[PDB]
């Protein structure tokens, strides 16, 4: 029942008298009952990665053996809440303790049991109806954005013996009783799930729909899909946290879980400050986006061993909302911090390191965590379809992408939004390096583009061609200069500069460029590529003639049109309607056509 | 057969990562198979990594999570891992441990074969001289594969090595002057990759002749230690006993090497380069060297491992030690992939060490060896000329350097580039090679004997 603390080397405690303690079991170390998880078990002694600071823990302190694994309470009350690494509601902690800190060993409930939730049972269900894991046996009106589907726990099944009538029920009241093989199971709205076990699904369907971020370079050149796995390597200050938050604010995911695993706490405070103000329109009514966002915060100075739990808790929450039929998006604020936490715990265990000190199982852990992302055909009787788009930022030390964490991540993630420090220093945000970055979902998304944005795939291909050609010409120019450049090479360079400065880069802290709808992302590219086509046509077709049109002639004649193309980004999706923006882009195209005709 | 009752020990003495150290074991047998019943009834399996007196360091395939001392029951099977093998293993899908995951029954053993394999006497191993017309001109033309060869696909993250492997699988065939049975061992492949390969096999109608071993990313990472051997064992049974021309694909030897490193670090062994076990060469060789033909038999085992080079580094211990064993390597380039070429096979660092004896008159054609040599020489000179141009500028390039650059461009545009569903016979590949060599004058094709230049150049 009780082990006894034997030693303490940091986040890692040792404990005697734990003969039958299972691996990765959850124990309470010390008199304050700091949560911890067994990670090795030698003889009758166990060793525990403690998810709270172990300072002040003395040998002989009790270690209670809770015969359960690290698990999360899943049920109504998650959305809009900010939890810590081990799912304690930080708002509830602050209200209960009336202190600005997080007491060590505080044991507040993950989901409040006092709130009366509006519960409406599934109409078809009756006494004596066969129900199984993942079946939705009720809906809880959590808020305006989220209809929290109440589902049987996976690995639960039987014949219904009592289904509660519609009404106001708290998270502790019994809502559904069923029986199987005679044994009777009672179920409230809350289900406890181990965080390290993948929540089952009937099938993992292929990813086929874009995860529309607010960023042009990500939406157009390197698309992500609903259910894909993404990475955002980049040095400090490159903008991966801002990309994560912009995806959290403006995206087509019905739910978003922000995991803040080992990063600043001011960033979590900023999320809490901004999201309640931000709103999205549902059925013509503005509703806050915090009503669908759940934060799992474990800042850099909070216990290191908790970071791992954070990640796991995050994904589990995502999986829970994936099983309802929602397209969850999990932002792992920094998986590099999780890898560093694993490295510290390994060092305390005196394990043999892999590359650069990381444990030999880092790649396996990352792969197993990223494998939980795909779009799925959720469990249960009602046929549904969820997703968990894992966007995991990486923080390579020294900005070197050879980092073991970054290298292991790139071998798992299908999309790679590598960020460049040089572009960030120039304030070229988003700092995505269009050359090295890639997305392995473009062929899976052409099916959707050809039917919704039929004109976009060739524009994307031509834009990437222009950028690659400009890269080659810049490599040449750096050593030889622009004197010997062919005129079409000058046009390639100048349109590539236009695309870089005025299409790819997008100031995310402005009323017009915070969100760039895909109609804008495609209209701007269409106009720039059209200008490229017209300039190249003029130059090539007048090379033989005496009236040789060059880049300089175009620039002098088309200064106003070039400035209009540069300022195309300033169109406001909200202040100026979609129709107005499309009409203005069409008018700019007409101006370009007329000016080129008057030039030739 | 083993009639003596097995011994079940509740004497687990320690758990450390993937390892479960037991004590008080009656005459431990090295490499013995153990069955661990967890407290909650979950049954796992493991292999005795080492024995010391009454101790036994079992290595659990499914992972040690949930195992506790005083309650886990390790029943020692008394024998090494002998996998069941049957001809009906073709058209089946098994997990990394060989259990069905296609909702079929467990394998009804035609025989029980040791996964470690039975070493083959070199005196009676036939030298493979039959070319495999994979249909990929970058492989057929310049790095040809001989039936019975070991030739990996070196690539990195994000490159189309899976697509190249699928193309080879669906196009592999002998040169026309016996269809391949595919055995697949996926180790650490995400769901997307496993689904891609399975759908590719079903669509192409070959599933009746395909046996898949899937160890996805979410699956246990010590299981993939046995996943390749299992596959190879089946291949051997199909090849040296059922007389089937087998083609063995091993998706990620990098993931297998990572599993090896995990077990080694758990064992606290003296590490090799980058933390990999000092014995990675021998463990990799025991897998690669199971290809080839043998005397008296009619079947063969063509082996095409696939490697994900970390940081694109061909000097990394995994690709390095794979080059030392396998006969060549097909090298997928990141630069070619970025430039939208497919297949992105860079023919400079890749080679096939059994190409010389597989090509030539009677096998494919008289000019094959010379055409390949001259294409390689021109490609290398063109790459050097490109490197020089990047520094000094094109205006300083001579006429011959411009010819080399034109050859390089048309070579990556016409020879290397190829549709994913286009299989170019070796003769079409050689015709394309000649059309590219004709860019240069005969005086510049130094590596082609005049007897062949006078016969093939003027056309």
């Amino acid at each position: 029942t009780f082990g006894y603390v034997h030693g303490v080397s940091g986040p890692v405690v040792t404990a005697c008298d734990m003969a039958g303690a299972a691996m990765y079991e959850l124990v309470r170390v010390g008199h304050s009952e700091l949560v911890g998880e067994i990670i090795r078990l030698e003889g009758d002694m166990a060793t525990i990665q403690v998810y709270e600071e172990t300072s002040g823990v003395s040998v002989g302190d009790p270690v209670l053996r809770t015969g359960k694994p690290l698990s999360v309470e899943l049920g109504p009350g998650i959305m809009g809440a900010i939890f810590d690494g081990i799912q304690r509601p930080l708002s509830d902690i602050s209200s209960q303790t009336q202190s600005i800190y997080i007491p060590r060993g505080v044991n507040v409930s993950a989901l409040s049991r006092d709130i009366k939730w509006e519960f409406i049972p599934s109409k078809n269900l009756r006494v004596g109806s066969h129900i199984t894991g993942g079946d939705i046996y009720g809906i809880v009106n959590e808020n305006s954005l989220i209809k929290h589907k109440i589902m049987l726990p996976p690995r639960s099944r039987g014949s219904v013996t009592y289904i509660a009538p519609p009404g106001n029920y708290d998270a502790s009241d019994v809502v559904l009783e069923l029986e199987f093989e005679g044994v009777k199971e009672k179920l409230s709205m809350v289900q406890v799930w181990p965080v390290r076990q993948v929540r089952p699904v009937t099938e993992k369907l292929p990813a086929n729909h874009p995860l529309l971020t607010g960023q042009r370079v990500l939406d157009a050149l390197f698309p992500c899909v609903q259910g894909g796995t993404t990475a955002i390597p980049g040095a400090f200050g490159c903008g991966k946290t801002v990309i994560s938050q912009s995806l959290s604010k403006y995206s087509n995911s019905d739910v978003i879980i922000y995991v803040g695993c080992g990063e600043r706490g001011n960033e979590m405070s900023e999320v809490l400050r901004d999201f309640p103000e931000l709103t999205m329109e549902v059925d013509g009514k503005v509703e806050s986006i915090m009503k669908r966002t759940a934060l799992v915060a474990n800042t850099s100075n909070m216990p290191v061993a908790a970071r791992e739990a954070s990640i796991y808790t995050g994904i589990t929450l995502s999986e829970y909302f994936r099983d309802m039929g929602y397209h969850v998006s999990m932002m792992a604020d920094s998986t590099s911090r999780w890898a560093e936490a694993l490295r510290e715990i390994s060092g305390r265990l005196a394990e043999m390191p892999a590359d650069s000190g990381y444990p030999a199982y880092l790649g396996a852990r990352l792969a197993s965590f990223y494998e939980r992302a795909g779009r799925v055909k959720c469990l249960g009787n009602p046929e549904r379809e969820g997703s968990v788009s894992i966007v995991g930022a990486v923080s390579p030390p020294g900005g070197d992408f050879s980092d073991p964490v970054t290298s292991a991540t790139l071998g798992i993630v299908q999309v790679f939004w590598g960020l460049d420090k040089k572009l960030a220093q120039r304030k070229h945000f988003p700092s995505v390096n269009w050359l090295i970055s890639y997305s392995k979902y473009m062929r899976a998304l052409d099916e959707y583009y050809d039917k919704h944005f039929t004109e976009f795939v060739p524009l994307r291909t031509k834009a990437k061609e222009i950028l690659q050609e400009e890269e080659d010409l810049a490599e040449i120019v750096q050593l030889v200069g622009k004197a010997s450049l062919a005129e079409t090479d000058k046009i390639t360079l100048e349109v590539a500069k236009l695309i870089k400065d005025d299409f790819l880069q997008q100031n995310g802290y402005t009323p017009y460029d915070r969100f760039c709808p895909f109609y804008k992302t495609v209209g701007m590219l269409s106009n720039m590529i059209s200008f490229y086509d017209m300039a190249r046509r003029a130059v090539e077709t007048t090379a033989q003639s005496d009236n040789k049109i060059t880049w300089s002639i175009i620039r002098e004649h088309m200064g106003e049109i070039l400035y209009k193309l540069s300022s195309m980004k300033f169109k406001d999706p909200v202040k100026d309607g979609e129709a107005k923006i499309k009409a203005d882009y069409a008018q700019l195209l007409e101006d370009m056509q007329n000016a080129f005709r008057s030039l030739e | 057969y083993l009639s003596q009752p097995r011994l079940t020990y509740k004497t687990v003495s320690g758990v450390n990562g993937p390892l479960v150290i037991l004590d008080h074991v009656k005459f431990p047998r090295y490499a013995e198979i153990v069955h661990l019943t967890l407290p909650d009834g979950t049954k796992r399996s493991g292999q005795v990594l080492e024995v010391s007196g009454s101790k036994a360091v079992v290595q659990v395939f499914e992972g040690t999570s949930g195992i506790d001392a005083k309650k886990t029951s390790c029943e020692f099977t008394g024998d090494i891992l002998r996998t069941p093998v049957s001809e009906d293993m073709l058209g089946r899908v098994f997990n990394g441990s060989g259990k069905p995951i296609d909702r079929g029954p467990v394998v009804l053993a035609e025989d029980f074969l040791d996964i470690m394999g039975q070493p083959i006497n070199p005196q009676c191993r036939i030298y493979p001289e039959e070319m495999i017309q994979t249909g990929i001109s970058a492989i057929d033309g310049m790095n040809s594969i001989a039936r019975g060869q070991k030739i990996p696909i070196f690539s990195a993250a994000g490159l189309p090595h899976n697509e190249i492997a699928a193309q080879i699988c669906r196009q592999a065939g002998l040169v026309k002057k016996e269809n391949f049975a595919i055995v697949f061992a996926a180790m650490g492949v995400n769901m997307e990759t496993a689904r891609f390969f399975k759908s590719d096999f079903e669509e192409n109608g070959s599933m009746d002749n395909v046996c898949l071993f899937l160890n996805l990313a979410n699956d246990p990472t010590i299981e993939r230690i046995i996943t390749p051997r299992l596959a190879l064992t089946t291949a051997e049974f199909l090849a040296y006993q059922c007389e089937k021309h087998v083609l063995v694909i091993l998706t990620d030897m990098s993931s297998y090497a990572e599993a090896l490193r995990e077990v080694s670090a758990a064992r606290e062994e003296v590490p090799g380069r980058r933390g990999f076990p000092g014995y990675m060469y021998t463990d990799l060789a025991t897998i690669y060297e199971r290809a080839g033909r043998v005397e008296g038999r009619n079947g063969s085992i063509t082996q095409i491992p696939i490697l994900t080079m970390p940081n694109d580094d061909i000097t990394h211990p995994i690709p390095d030690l794979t080059g030392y064993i396998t006969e060549g390597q097909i090298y997928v380039d990141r630069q070619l992939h970025n430039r939208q070429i497919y297949p992105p096979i860079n023919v400079l660092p890749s080679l096939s060490r059994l190409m010389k004896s597989a090509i030539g008159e009677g096998m494919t054609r008289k000019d094959h060896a010379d055409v390949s040599n001259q294409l390689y020489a021109c490609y290398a000179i063109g790459k050097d000329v490109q490197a020089m141009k990047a520094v000094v500028g094109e205006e300083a390039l001579t006429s011959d350097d411009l010819l080399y650059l034109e050859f390089l461009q048309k070579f990556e545009k016409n020879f290397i580039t190829q549709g994913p569903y286009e299989n170019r016979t070796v003769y079409e590949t050689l015709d394309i090679g000649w059309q590219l060599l004709r860019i240069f004058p005969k005086e510049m094709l130094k590596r082609i004997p005049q007897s062949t230049l006078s016969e093939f150049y003027p056309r």
């Binding site: 005196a350 043999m352 390191p353 | 606290e268 003296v270």
Partner: peptide
């Protein structure tokens, strides 16, 4: 160097265990 130092420490501990 770190790996070799760790191996040396483990060898010393094992020698003490045997003694």
């Amino acid at each position: 160097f770190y790996r070799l130092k760790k191996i040396q420490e483990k060898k010393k501990i094992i020698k003490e265990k045997s003694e």
